[PDB]
Write an enzyme that holds these catalytic residues in place. Structure first.
Site, PDB file in Angstrom:
ATOM      1  N   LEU A  22       0.828  -1.199   0.000  1.00 19.57           N
ATOM      2  CA  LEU A  22       0.000   0.000   0.000  1.00 19.57           C
ATOM      3  C   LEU A  22       0.877   1.271   0.000  1.00 19.57           C
ATOM      4  O   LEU A  22       2.001   1.268   0.531  1.00 19.57           O
ATOM      5  CB  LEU A  22      -1.021  -0.028   1.145  1.00 19.57           C
ATOM      6  CG  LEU A  22      -2.009  -1.211   1.216  1.00 19.57           C
ATOM      7  CD1 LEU A  22      -3.073  -0.923   2.245  1.00 19.57           C
ATOM      8  CD2 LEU A  22      -2.646  -1.549  -0.128  1.00 19.57           C
ATOM      9  N   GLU A  30      -8.369   0.769   9.583  1.00 23.59           N
ATOM     10  CA  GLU A  30      -8.822   0.648   8.194  1.00 23.59           C
ATOM     11  C   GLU A  30      -8.736  -0.827   7.773  1.00 23.59           C
ATOM     12  O   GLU A  30      -9.664  -1.358   7.152  1.00 23.59           O
ATOM     13  CB  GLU A  30      -8.029   1.567   7.255  1.00 23.59           C
ATOM     14  CG  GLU A  30      -8.814   2.038   6.021  1.00 23.59           C
ATOM     15  CD  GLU A  30      -9.043   0.944   4.995  1.00 23.59           C
ATOM     16  OE1 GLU A  30     -10.182   0.854   4.476  1.00 23.59           O
ATOM     17  OE2 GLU A  30      -8.094   0.178   4.719  1.00 23.59           O
TER      18      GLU A  30
HETATM   19  N1  LIG Z   1      -5.369  -0.255  -1.771  1.00 25.87           N
HETATM   20  C1  LIG Z   1      -6.147  -1.328  -1.971  1.00 25.87           C
HETATM   21  O1  LIG Z   1      -7.286  -1.430  -1.536  1.00 25.87           O
HETATM   22  C2  LIG Z   1      -5.540  -2.461  -2.802  1.00 25.87           C
HETATM   23  C3  LIG Z   1      -4.236  -2.350  -3.243  1.00 25.87           C
HETATM   24  N2  LIG Z   1      -3.681  -3.371  -4.005  1.00 25.87           N
HETATM   25  C4  LIG Z   1      -2.295  -3.201  -4.455  1.00 25.87           C
HETATM   26  O2  LIG Z   1      -2.284  -3.288  -5.891  1.00 25.87           O
HETATM   27  C5  LIG Z   1      -0.996  -3.819  -6.187  1.00 25.87           C
HETATM   28  C6  LIG Z   1      -0.976  -4.366  -7.588  1.00 25.87           C
HETATM   29  O3  LIG Z   1      -2.158  -5.067  -8.014  1.00 25.87           O
HETATM   30  P1  LIG Z   1      -2.159  -5.231  -9.582  1.00 25.87           P
HETATM   31  O4  LIG Z   1      -0.790  -4.871 -10.029  1.00 25.87           O
HETATM   32  O5  LIG Z   1      -3.321  -4.539 -10.172  1.00 25.87           O
HETATM   33  O6  LIG Z   1      -2.308  -6.853  -9.805  1.00 25.87           O
HETATM   34  P2  LIG Z   1      -3.471  -8.072  -9.737  1.00 25.87           P
HETATM   35  O7  LIG Z   1      -3.643  -8.510  -8.355  1.00 25.87           O
HETATM   36  O8  LIG Z   1      -4.703  -7.793 -10.500  1.00 25.87           O
HETATM   37  O9  LIG Z   1      -2.591  -9.185 -10.429  1.00 25.87           O
HETATM   38  C7  LIG Z   1      -2.243  -9.067 -11.783  1.00 25.87           C
HETATM   39  C8  LIG Z   1      -1.943 -10.461 -12.138  1.00 25.87           C
HETATM   40  O10 LIG Z   1      -3.123 -11.181 -11.561  1.00 25.87           O
HETATM   41  C9  LIG Z   1      -3.573 -12.128 -12.525  1.00 25.87           C
HETATM   42  N3  LIG Z   1      -4.921 -11.613 -13.114  1.00 25.87           N
HETATM   43  C10 LIG Z   1      -5.436 -10.381 -12.943  1.00 25.87           C
HETATM   44  N4  LIG Z   1      -6.627 -10.297 -13.549  1.00 25.87           N
HETATM   45  C11 LIG Z   1      -6.907 -11.478 -14.090  1.00 25.87           C
HETATM   46  C12 LIG Z   1      -7.984 -11.976 -14.826  1.00 25.87           C
HETATM   47  N5  LIG Z   1      -9.037 -11.212 -15.122  1.00 25.87           N
HETATM   48  N6  LIG Z   1      -7.950 -13.258 -15.240  1.00 25.87           N
HETATM   49  C13 LIG Z   1      -6.912 -14.039 -14.959  1.00 25.87           C
HETATM   50  N7  LIG Z   1      -5.877 -13.590 -14.264  1.00 25.87           N
HETATM   51  C14 LIG Z   1      -5.830 -12.319 -13.813  1.00 25.87           C
HETATM   52  C15 LIG Z   1      -2.233 -12.233 -13.254  1.00 25.87           C
HETATM   53  O11 LIG Z   1      -2.374 -12.983 -14.363  1.00 25.87           O
HETATM   54  P3  LIG Z   1      -1.263 -14.029 -14.769  1.00 25.87           P
HETATM   55  O12 LIG Z   1      -0.642 -14.926 -13.573  1.00 25.87           O
HETATM   56  O13 LIG Z   1      -2.043 -14.831 -15.726  1.00 25.87           O
HETATM   57  O14 LIG Z   1      -0.125 -13.174 -15.535  1.00 25.87           O
HETATM   58  C16 LIG Z   1      -1.960 -10.796 -13.602  1.00 25.87           C
HETATM   59  O15 LIG Z   1      -0.647 -10.649 -14.163  1.00 25.87           O
HETATM   60  C17 LIG Z   1      -0.819  -4.959  -5.188  1.00 25.87           C
HETATM   61  O16 LIG Z   1       0.567  -5.215  -4.970  1.00 25.87           O
HETATM   62  C18 LIG Z   1      -1.473  -4.383  -3.929  1.00 25.87           C
HETATM   63  O17 LIG Z   1      -0.527  -3.898  -2.968  1.00 25.87           O
HETATM   64  C19 LIG Z   1      -4.414  -4.533  -4.336  1.00 25.87           C
HETATM   65  C20 LIG Z   1      -5.724  -4.641  -3.891  1.00 25.87           C
HETATM   66  C21 LIG Z   1      -6.284  -3.605  -3.133  1.00 25.87           C
HETATM   67  C1  LIG Z   2      -6.080  -7.239  -1.213  1.00 21.65           C
HETATM   68  O1  LIG Z   2      -6.652  -6.246  -0.357  1.00 21.65           O
HETATM   69  C2  LIG Z   2      -6.241  -6.346   0.930  1.00 21.65           C
HETATM   70  C3  LIG Z   2      -6.083  -7.595   1.542  1.00 21.65           C
HETATM   71  C4  LIG Z   2      -5.673  -7.655   2.867  1.00 21.65           C
HETATM   72  C5  LIG Z   2      -5.400  -6.482   3.558  1.00 21.65           C
HETATM   73  O2  LIG Z   2      -4.990  -6.538   4.853  1.00 21.65           O
HETATM   74  C6  LIG Z   2      -6.077  -6.236   5.717  1.00 21.65           C
HETATM   75  C7  LIG Z   2      -5.885  -6.958   7.038  1.00 21.65           C
HETATM   76  C8  LIG Z   2      -7.241  -7.425   7.531  1.00 21.65           C
HETATM   77  C9  LIG Z   2      -7.118  -8.808   8.156  1.00 21.65           C
HETATM   78  C10 LIG Z   2      -8.099  -9.813   7.537  1.00 21.65           C
HETATM   79  O3  LIG Z   2      -8.920  -9.412   6.677  1.00 21.65           O
HETATM   80  O4  LIG Z   2      -8.002 -10.982   7.949  1.00 21.65           O
HETATM   81  C11 LIG Z   2      -5.558  -5.248   2.935  1.00 21.65           C
HETATM   82  C12 LIG Z   2      -5.984  -5.161   1.616  1.00 21.65           C
HETATM   83  C13 LIG Z   2      -6.111  -3.761   0.992  1.00 21.65           C
HETATM   84  C14 LIG Z   2      -7.433  -3.054   1.313  1.00 21.65           C
HETATM   85  C15 LIG Z   2      -7.431  -2.210   2.413  1.00 21.65           C
HETATM   86  N1  LIG Z   2      -8.538  -1.553   2.732  1.00 21.65           N
HETATM   87  C16 LIG Z   2      -9.678  -1.658   2.007  1.00 21.65           C
HETATM   88  N2  LIG Z   2     -10.750  -0.975   2.364  1.00 21.65           N
HETATM   89  N3  LIG Z   2      -9.734  -2.436   0.931  1.00 21.65           N
HETATM   90  C17 LIG Z   2      -8.634  -3.139   0.582  1.00 21.65           C
HETATM   91  N4  LIG Z   2      -8.726  -3.913  -0.496  1.00 21.65           N
END
Ligand SMILES: NC(=O)C1=CN([C@@H]2O[C@H](COP(=O)(O)OP(=O)(O)OC[C@H]3O[C@@H](n4cnc5c(N)ncnc54)[C@@H](OP(=O)(O)O)[C@@H]3O)[C@@H](O)[C@H]2O)C=CC1
Ligand SMILES: COc1ccc(OCCCCC(=O)O)cc1Cc1cnc(N)nc1N
Length: 186
Positions: A22, A30
């Site tokens: 993050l 959060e």
């Molecule tokens: N702030 C937040 O709430 C969140 C933050 N994040 C952050 O985002 C960062 C990056 O995420 P991001 O780079 O978008 O990557 P994703 O988690 O979407 O992963 C991308 C990889 O996931 C597979 N994939 C994704 N979509 C598909 C699909 N539709 N079908 C099949 N396979 C799929 C991989 O395919 P393959 O193995 O086939 O190449 C692809 O290369 C994470 O490191 C995390 O820290 C993530 C979630 C929430």
């Molecule tokens: C992939 O998205 C997340 C997955 C885990 C995460 O850590 C949260 C700890 C909670 C412990 C548990 O659930 O067991 C954080 C994220 C990112 C994320 C953060 N906040 C919100 N609102 N959405 C997210 N996807």
């Protein structure tokens, strides 16, 4: 199977990640909100399903993988089987959603929560149907290398209230944030 939802925390500049983590320092309450929302099931005898991309899966610390009390499904076309600790693997979001209709999951899954990353959020957000977005607005800019897709407010209505979601400004580690819920149905 119950409702389909996305959940994200995003900075003012739409950032959701940097270098596989993050963009902001840990915000303990959060994270607790994320845990509570994704875990809490409205239906007796069921669990929620979390769907995530491969990079998102590996971004979760190993000690928190799989997300406990939830069915964990990873999307990948490269992987041949679910990663260590994961429960299911699908090669597309459509495949994952179809899977939840199969006899193995049809009676087990309540809500489905898409938890990232960017491409998964985008596909879900542009897919016709009933969808909610649970969005935490982190109210500053943070350097990021992965971003949340545009929310089309013509389709996604910001809800004026939602049960179990605090409406006022939160603050952790000197960072203000607020919780929002959006809903579309098309
Ligand atoms: N702030 C937040 O709430 C969140 C933050 N994040 C952050 O985002 C960062 C990056 O995420 P991001 O780079 O978008 O990557 P994703 O988690 O979407 O992963 C991308 C990889 O996931 C597979 N994939 C994704 N979509 C598909 C699909 N539709 N079908 C099949 N396979 C799929 C991989 O395919 P393959 O193995 O086939 O190449 C692809 O290369 C994470 O490191 C995390 O820290 C993530 C979630 C929430
Ligand atoms: C992939 O998205 C997340 C997955 C885990 C995460 O850590 C949260 C700890 C909670 C412990 C548990 O659930 O067991 C954080 C994220 C990112 C994320 C953060 N906040 C919100 N609102 N959405 C997210 N996807």
């Amino acid at each position: 199977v119950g409702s389909l939802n996305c959940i994200v925390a995003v900075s003012q500049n739409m950032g959701i990640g940097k270098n596989g983590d993050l963009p902001w320092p840990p915000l303990r309450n959060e994270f607790r909100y994320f845990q509570r929302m994704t875990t809490t099931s409205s239906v007796e005898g069921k669990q929620n399903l979390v769907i995530m991309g491969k990079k998102t899966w590996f971004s979760i610390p190993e000690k928190n993988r799989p997300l406990k009390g939830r069915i964990n499904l990873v999307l990948s076309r490269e992987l041949k089987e679910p990663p260590q600790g994961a429960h299911f693997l699908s090669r597309s979001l459509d495949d994952a959603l179809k899977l939840t209709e199969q006899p193995e999951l049809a009676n087990k899954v309540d809500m489905v929560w898409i938890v990232g990353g960017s491409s998964v959020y985008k596909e879900a957000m542009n897919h016709p149907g009933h969808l909610k977005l649970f969005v935490t607005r982190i109210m500053q800019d943070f350097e990021s290398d992965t971003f949340f897709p545009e929310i089309d407010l013509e389709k996604y209505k910001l809800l004026p209230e939602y049960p179990g979601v605090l409406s006022d400004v939160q603050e952790e580690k000197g960072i203000k944030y607020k919780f929002e819920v959006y809903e579309k149905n098309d």
